[PDB]
Paper text:
The otopetrin (OTOP) proteins were recently characterized as extracellular proton-activated proton channels. Several recent OTOP channel structures demonstrated that the channels form a dimer with each subunit adopting a double-barrel architecture. In this study, we performed structural and functional characterization of the Caenorhabditis elegans OTOP8 (CeOTOP8) and mouse OTOP2 (mOTOP2) and illuminated a set of conformational changes related to the proton-conducting process in OTOP. Combining the structural information from both channels, we propose a working model describing the multi-step conformational changes during the proton conducting process.
Mouse OTOP2 was expressed in HEK293F cells and purified in glyco-diosgenin (GDN) detergent. Its single-particle cryo-EM structures were determined using protein samples prepared at various pH conditions (5.0, 7.0, 8.0, and 9.0). The mOTOP2 structures at pH 8.0 and 9.0 are virtually identical. Among all, the mOTOP2 structures determined at pH 5.0 and 8.0 are better resolved and will be used to represent the low and high pH structures, respectively, in the following discussion. The structure difference in mOTOP2 between low and high pH conditions is quite subtle and mainly occurs at the N-terminal half of TM6 preceding the highly conserved glutamate (Glu250 in mOTOP2) important for proton transfer. At higher pH, however, the N-terminal half of the TM6 helix unwinds to an extended loop (right insets). This helix-to-loop structural transition occurs before the conserved Pro246 and vacates the space above Glu250 initially occupied by Pro246, allowing the Glu250 side chain to flip upwards and become completely exposed to the external solution. The outward-facing Glu250 is also stabilized by forming an H-bond with Tyr245 and a salt bridge with Arg517 in the high pH mOTOP2 structure. In state 1, a loop configuration at the N-terminal part of TM6 allows the glutamate to be exposed to the extracellular solution for protonation. The two conformations observed in mOTOP2 structures represent these first two states of the proton-conducting process, whereas the CeOTOP8 structures likely capture the next two states (states 3 and 4).
Author numbering:
A (entry chain B), B (entry chain A): 27 to 86, 97 to 157, 164 to 195, 238 to 269, 288 to 314, 320 to 354, 361 to 429, 487 to 563
The structure:
């Protein structure tokens, strides 16, 4: 009853959808997508109709602030992909099912209505069930999108990545936040300069080799920047912690702590999978050494940055405050540049040749499509938390 | 800090173990088990050493009652399998690694110490971390055991099923319960007769065809009993609910409700996977019709029994109480007989020929090994809840 009644509906609805998505994709007789698209369209239709009904009856603690920006950005990218899908599937209809053209139209409506509904965020019991059903709708969409990339391998621009995984993650987090609240009662000129330099070098590395085989030098450049970037934050964040050593009536920021370590778990899994794939696999060559160092540095960077940020938030000589400004700002700028790759780069990175060979394309694509989008969550929260730290001290 | 510090350790430890288990088993270069066994032995060793240290320092709200009985029963079955493993791997050592014989010895010690530790259940912070680490230890063991069955296909009795999946489920549930409590501040002679008759018929069906190809008649007998058994409870439980219609200052039994629907999710997934495998797959033959009816009846039986039990618990003519006694007792006896198959029958049921062909042996074995052990949880709680209902009214 009440809150638990809505939760039980969601898991039962999610379990039903997940079985149909997984069963229809991982069976041996044939691969079914029209049924899966028919399923997703039905869930989106009901979810949109509850939201539309909710908006009309309402038009008469909020969680992270970066959540709304990510939802709109990834919602727009989904809309562009949904607009391109209707344009392509409308040129020919004689050789394609109706569900394949009706699905993008419904998805575009669902994204538009849900994004507006979440942006501006009685039967509190109906509201909870409707929110829980929509949360399961996005998680059902998230699983189908993840499965789609795994099973793989006029405009005609099919290269457009459907940002369904990222949009569903942002929507599901925002839907849960709303549901929980239903019925609630100077500068040393060393860090900023270095941080800006890595931002430009990192931005160039994304455009040249990450937007879309490649060359040996291109692979070394990507690893060289990442190793330098991750290594510098690990040293800088470690420096930040030892400064706190040479120096309480507030409560623990459980949400901030949980988000930092929780969202870092995605990159931990990527690193853990990478390490085994190099220890066994790559024949101790240059790429393996670079892969091993990059994977270890991600673990180290995430660990030490999280320690520095968590201690900095809870506490709340002139150089001490001055040095902490560049340390926070250098970590902020480096976190921003490392956010673009998990956000707009091809999930199976061209640098993951060793990983793809070890696990297979389908398994590795599943791993990155599940784990990398959580890196997005981590980078925004790291930037937002570092912004508060820099503003604070 | 505090409770969250222990939780964060567990997920980080569990994620590390899960990646090594999944990475070492689902890669293409080679399958690694000695490393996985070496990993599990290390986790069990530390978990056992914390428990041993905990017992010495302590020897100077409890959740379901059936939990302890399931832990001891499945712990004993694991010990018999661990005893048989040492006996087999000690006859020859010239052609097998040392980790393969050291693992059962450590596992037997871990099971013995953990079962005793959980049966009798300061540094509250150390205690929480130790409990969380052991909880992740059992979940790491649970995942490795599930993966072992999927990748498949003197005494010499290797047929002995390692009840690692079931024991780990019971241990992890008991470990979480303890962790949460750390630092806490007549008869109509119609149902019993019918229930007993189905118990004998069901018990015979388990011995004849379920302990261990088979015959067509054997398959029909298994479906005939299950369809009759599941159909009867659906009618009986529905009868029980309509009786409540022809007739509040207590709180909702959230744990009892969550356990009923939560544990029923495993059979829901089995049924959902079964239905698709018959709708597409089996060529509308006798087995498909029996499979379809059995899968649907499991969904119906679980749904209506849960509704009847949940309403019965919350509320707390002479025939009205008399009829409810046989209805509760008939459901109790039928729940007991349907508990033995998910508990001691071969996970890939001989009746799942259609399912195995549709999904493949590896995928279906993974599905049943994940979902069926939760049916155990459901059956015990259904029996325990029905026992309270029969005692109450």
């Amino acid at each position: 009853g009440g809150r638990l009644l809505s939760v039980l509906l969601a898991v039962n609805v999610l379990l039903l959808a997940c079985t149909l998505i997984s069963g229809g994709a991982f069976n041996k007789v044939a691969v079914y997508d029209t049924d899966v698209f028919a399923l997703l369209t039905t869930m989106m239709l009901l979810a949109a109709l509850w939201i539309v009904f909710y908006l009309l009856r309402t038009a008469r603690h909020a969680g992270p602030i970066w959540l709304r920006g990510g939802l709109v950005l990834f919602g727009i990218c989904t809309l562009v992909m949904d607009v391109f899908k209707t344009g392509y599937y409308s040129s020919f209809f004689e050789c394609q099912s109706a569900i394949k053209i009706l699905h993008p139209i419904i998805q575009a409506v669902f994204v538009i209505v849900q994004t507006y509904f979440l942006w501006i965020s009685t039967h509190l019991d109906l509201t909870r069930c409707g929110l829980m059903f929509t949360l399961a709708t996005n998680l059902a969409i998230w699983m189908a999108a993840v499965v789609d990339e795994s099973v793989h391998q006029q405009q005609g621009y099919f290269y457009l990545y459907p940002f369904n995984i990222e949009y569903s993650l942002f929507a599901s987090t925002m839907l849960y936040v709303m549901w929980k609240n239903v019925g609630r009662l100077e500068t040393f000129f060393a860090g900023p300069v270095l941080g800006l330099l890595l931002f430009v070098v990192g931005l160039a590395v994304f455009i040249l080799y990450e937007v879309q085989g490649h060359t040996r030098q291109a692979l070394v450049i990507y690893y060289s920047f990442n190793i330098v970037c991750l290594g510098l934050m690990t040293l800088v964040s470690l420096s930040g912690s030892v400064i706190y050593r040479f120096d309480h009536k507030n409560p623990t920021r459980t949400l901030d702590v949980a988000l930092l370590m929780g969202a870092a778990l995605g990159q931990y899994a990527i690193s853990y999978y990478s390490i085994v794939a190099v220890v066994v696999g790559s024949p101790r060559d240059l790429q393996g050494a670079l892969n091993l160092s990059h994977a270890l540095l991600m673990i180290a960077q995430h660990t030490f940055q999280n320690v520095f940020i968590i201690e900095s938030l809870h506490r709340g000589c002139h150089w001490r405050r001055r040095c902490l400004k560049d340390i926070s700002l250098f970590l902020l700028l480096c976190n921003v540049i490392l956010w673009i790759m998990p956000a707009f780069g091809a999930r199976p990175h061209f640098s993951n040749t060793v990983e793809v060979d070890f696990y297979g394309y389908s398994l590795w694509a599943a791993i990155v499509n599940i784990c990398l989008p959580f890196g997005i969550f981590y980078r925004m929260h790291a930037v937002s938390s570092l912004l508060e730290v820099y503003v604070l001290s």
